[PDB]
A paper describes a structure:
Optimized crystals of native TsFL routinely diffracted beyond 2.5 Å and structure was solved by SAD phasing using a platinum soaked derivative. The resulting model was refined to 2.20 Å and contained residues 1–142, 149–237 and 245–525. TsFL subunits are comprised of three structural domains: an N-terminal ATPase domain, a helical dimerization domain, and a C-terminal Toprim domain. The dimerization domain inserts between the β8 and β9 strands of the ATPase domain and consists of four helices (α1D, α2D, α3D and α4D) that form a kinked structure. α1D, α2D and α4D from each subunit directly associate in trans at the dimer interface while α3D bends back and rests on top of α4A and α5A. Together these interactions form an extensive hydrophobic network that buries 3479 Å2 of surface area and maintains the tight association between the subunits. The amphipathic α2T helix packs against a hydrophobic groove on the edge of ATPase domain formed by α6A, α7A, α8A and β11A to bury 920Å2. Despite attempts to co-crystallize with ATP analogs, only a sulfate ion deriving from the crystallization buffer was present in the TsFL active site. These residues are conserved among all Class 1 homologs and in the TsFL structure coordinate a single samarium ion from the crystallization conditions. This suggests that the TsFL conformation captured in the crystal is non-productive for ATPase hydrolysis and would require additional conformational rearrangements, likely triggered by nucleotide binding, to achieve a more canonical organization of the ATPase domains.
OLD homologs are widely conserved in bacteria, archaea and some viruses and can be subdivided into two classes. Class 1 OLD homologs exist as single, isolated genes while Class 2 old genes always appear in tandem with a UvrD/PcrA/Rep-like helicase. Here, we present the crystal structure of a full-length Class 1 OLD nuclease from Thermus scotoductus (Ts) at 2.20 Å resolution.
Residue numbers in the entry:
A (entry chain A), B (entry chain A): 1 to 142, 149 to 237, 245 to 525
């Protein structure tokens, strides 16, 4: 599998370095580098040998510069053994001094050096070596489909095939029904003309070449097989559905298929089908049957609970592309937080919207979101137009989790939550007093952990709780019409003292 | 045929407006707008219906702006009649206020307005209307080929086809040799999964859909036919040769095929094959059998004698794309100059290099070029590295022609030529004296015409001639070794007075 990508001076990617894992989910705004990361991988490892014909000069250089060298380095594991060399990466360079540019594909060892022979010449990247690490690229290709993707599916079929001779005779029999006299004269005009054009190259005989009409190589028929259907946004959805079916056949066939890159796996799938596809891709990645690298705009394919997969790509104040992800050092602390949330917590795909927003307001629960959005409306802010995600995190442990992801990804955020500490009723019985004390301490610990990960300047605490600030019963705590009519009597100008941290949280997350 | 293209705010094309003719040859440096012109036409008239899915937002807006509206207008002739409307152009707009963008395809009448019905609603662009003007786009697609290009070739074949029933039974017979038990289980997994993904859309039955393997629609087999060969730069050349063969079949079939756009018709063809292809494209355009619009880097496809075809595209001091061409007003004067050159003049493809250069030095003849290039070498300038074309124009009338094209195209240039006026030998006989006088006046007229079109500040005159300045005989006037050894004794520092206009011409064309 691919392990790491380095890109220098390629289109919008001035300098970038990101890890790659069994599932790599790449998110970020349009034009901010997302697709260019994928194209850089395809340049080195796609099915066209990297050469000067692979680049647009100067289109592919930063600023159309060309005094800078394009450099794409792809690292992988396990190493490729060539004789006495173990190669762990390829480095594709395109540079030049005007006006002769050139590209090199160099092999690199564990230590980042190009091995050389005792003769002193460097080791060059050969066919077997590059095909070692080749990737399937599913870009938006989506009444028929075909590609190296289906080809890889049929390669166990193409193997045990044993009726090649019979197929040739039936195939030719069918081609003869097509070869009208006019068809043959059209074919002869094409083939004779092409051969004359080729003759100018001087390479002869060359007269061994057959050029004609047909719809398959009868020797290797499974190389022209496609999926087809009878009968366009409808057509596009059908072709997306057939792709899901192809991947479902892979999973049942169990064969390892290596590295697949997908531009927007969601496209033209119903959300329910996107859920089915994502679950399928995750099973194959986790089972170690392939590696999936993709760009996505869908919160169904960008799961906050799988935070190791996340790469967030965007341009900084200076139009410099920057990639964010959970650092290795930090994975274990966030994983602990993910586990604490899984005890009693429930997962919610809607929370993944945090990954697509300019800014996030993190709240505990459904009632808090309803109240937040009504206050937005009273402050005359539309959170959808401002790309502010208001995220129901599923309680305090859930907030910790989303905070840790936002912190690791450099997503700006504000937290609001209740204090949930209550004075002890000195008249209650021993068990109630003791349990109140213990609950207060537990809540204080949860409040302190949120403060430690978010920072205090990003956290607003409603004392003792939003329910108490609103005067709202326990029954009605989540009824939107009840929350709305209470909040409609409040004055955003001077929100009550109890309610003040809630509306100030919304003012902070709104502040440009 | 397409008549005109207007592009506003699309990628690098801030504002541009160019005529389109039966042959349109688009030249200019890489990234300077050449290919973007072609892509803009394809957006409106390619085989994908223009919609919001056609654009990259913000990638396709100038500066990734999106506060500006993309506008592509394609004009054509003859008009399309829809009921009582005559449409002569389509206008594709993509704009929006964040964050909902949208695209409109509007029909336009003779006067540039969108017709509306008595109801007041505008006329919309329908299928038949847009297909009226659809273009074949041959982009770099180049062991098999296929596209709407071959499809258009076979459409007279697909017509008179009458063995559909027999073909179905032989075709299925061949598919049965492939359908192993494992193949059928793979196919059932694909089809059942795709149908389940489609079922989430709610559209039912939908159970009428057949999804399976195959290599043709047995009902319409000529829609899956391809050209193939046995067996990659060699492969790329073969596929280019097959394209030439397809166009040669078109010319023999005589059917009109409308508008074809080609990205770099030269690519992977031998120069001799490029000459064959260009001649073929010109016959079809002149015979009115199609319209060819292409970008090119080849002087074989960009003929200075066909100056009406030329469009030169480049970025000005400010990175603003500017297109140049011979204006309508000016065509008749340049055509007169082209005719005067055709009496006794000989054509030379090498002269087309003027169209690809940063600057051109225009000289009369072969001996003048040799001398120019040797002086470049003595001035320690490499004209190839500086993109200076030294152009042998074929005599003074030939210089007029190239000057007129360079002037119309805004190519910077310098002219050097001989005066060729000689004192009359008062001892000669009457006929020689009279002929000398008449030749002097003829030469003076030719010298004056060059001065009128080039401007005097761009013209250097060697008095009486370079041969006389060099002291070189008539025999040796064109022998490079003789010219070189004479020039090697000259001092670029203070070239003789007779030679001075020649070396000063070279210093001017070299001056940044
Ligand atoms: Pt980009
Ligand atoms: Pt891109
Ligand atoms: Pt461009
Ligand atoms: Pt481009
Ligand atoms: Sm609460
Ligand atoms: Sm001369």
């Amino acid at each position: 599998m691919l392990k790491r990508l380095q890109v220098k001076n390629f289109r919008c990617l001035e300098d970038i370095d990101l890890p790659l894992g069994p599932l790599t989910a790449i998110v970020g705004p349009n034009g901010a580098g997302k697709t260019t990361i994928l194209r850089a991988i395809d340049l080195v490892l796609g099915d066209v040998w990297p050469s000067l014909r692979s680049f647009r000069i100067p289109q592919d250089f930063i600023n159309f510069d060309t005094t800078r060298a394009i450099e794409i380095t792809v690292h992988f594991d396990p190493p490729y053994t060539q004789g006495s060399f173990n190669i762990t990466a390829f480095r594709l360079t395109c540079k030049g001094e005007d006006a002769d540019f050139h590209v090199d594909l160099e092999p690199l060892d564990e230590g980042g050096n190009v091995p050389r022979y005792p003769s002193g010449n460097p080791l060059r990247v050969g066919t077997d070596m590059r095909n070692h690490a080749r990737v399937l690229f599913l870009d938006h290709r989506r009444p028929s489909i075909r590609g190296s993707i289906l080809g890889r599916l049929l390669q166990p079929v193409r193997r045990e095939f044993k009726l090649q001779d019979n197929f040739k005779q039936v195939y030719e029999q069918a081609m003869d029904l097509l070869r009208t006299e006019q068809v043959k004269q059209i074919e002869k005009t094409i083939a004779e003309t092409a051969k004359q054009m080729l003759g100018f190259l001087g390479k002869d005989a060359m007269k061994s070449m057959e050029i004609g009409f047909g719809f398959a190589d009868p020797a290797n028929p499974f190389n022209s097989l496609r999926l087809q259907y009878r009968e366009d946004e409808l057509g596009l959805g059908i072709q997306s559905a057939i792709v899901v079916g192809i991947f479902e056949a892979f999973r049942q066939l169990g064969e390892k298929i290596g590295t697949v890159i997908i531009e927007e796996p969601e496209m033209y799938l119903h959300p329910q089908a996107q859920r089915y596809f994502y679950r399928l891709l995750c099973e194959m990645a986790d089972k170690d049957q392939c590696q999936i690298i993709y760009s996505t705009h869908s919160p169904i394919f960008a799961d906050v609970n799988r935070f190791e997969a996340l790469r967030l790509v965007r341009k900084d104040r200076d139009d410099r592309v920057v990639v964010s992800y959970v650092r290795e050092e930090d994975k274990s602390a966030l994983d602990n937080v993910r586990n604490r949330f899984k005890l009693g917590g429930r997962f919610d795909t809607a929370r993944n919207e945090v990954l697509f927003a300019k800014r996030a307001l993190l709240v505990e629960g459904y009632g808090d979101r309803v109240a937040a959005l009504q206050l937005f409306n009273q402050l005359e802010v539309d959170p959808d137009a401002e790309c502010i995600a208001v995220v129901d995190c599923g309680g305090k442990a859930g907030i910790e989790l989303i905070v840790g992801v936002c912190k690791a990804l450099d997503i700006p955020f504000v937290v609001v939550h209740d204090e949930d500490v209550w004075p002890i009723d000195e008249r209650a019985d021993e068990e109630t007093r003791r349990k109140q004390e213990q609950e207060n301490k537990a809540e204080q610990e949860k409040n302190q952990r949120i403060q430690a990960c978010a920072g205090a300047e990003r956290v607003f605490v409603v004392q003792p709780s939003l329910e108490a600030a609103l005067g709202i019963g326990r029954n009605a705590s989540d009824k939107p019409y009840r929350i709305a009519e209470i909040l409609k009597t409040v004055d955003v100008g001077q929100p009550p003292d109890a309610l003040r941290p809630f509306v100030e949280a919304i003012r902070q997350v709104t502040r440009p």
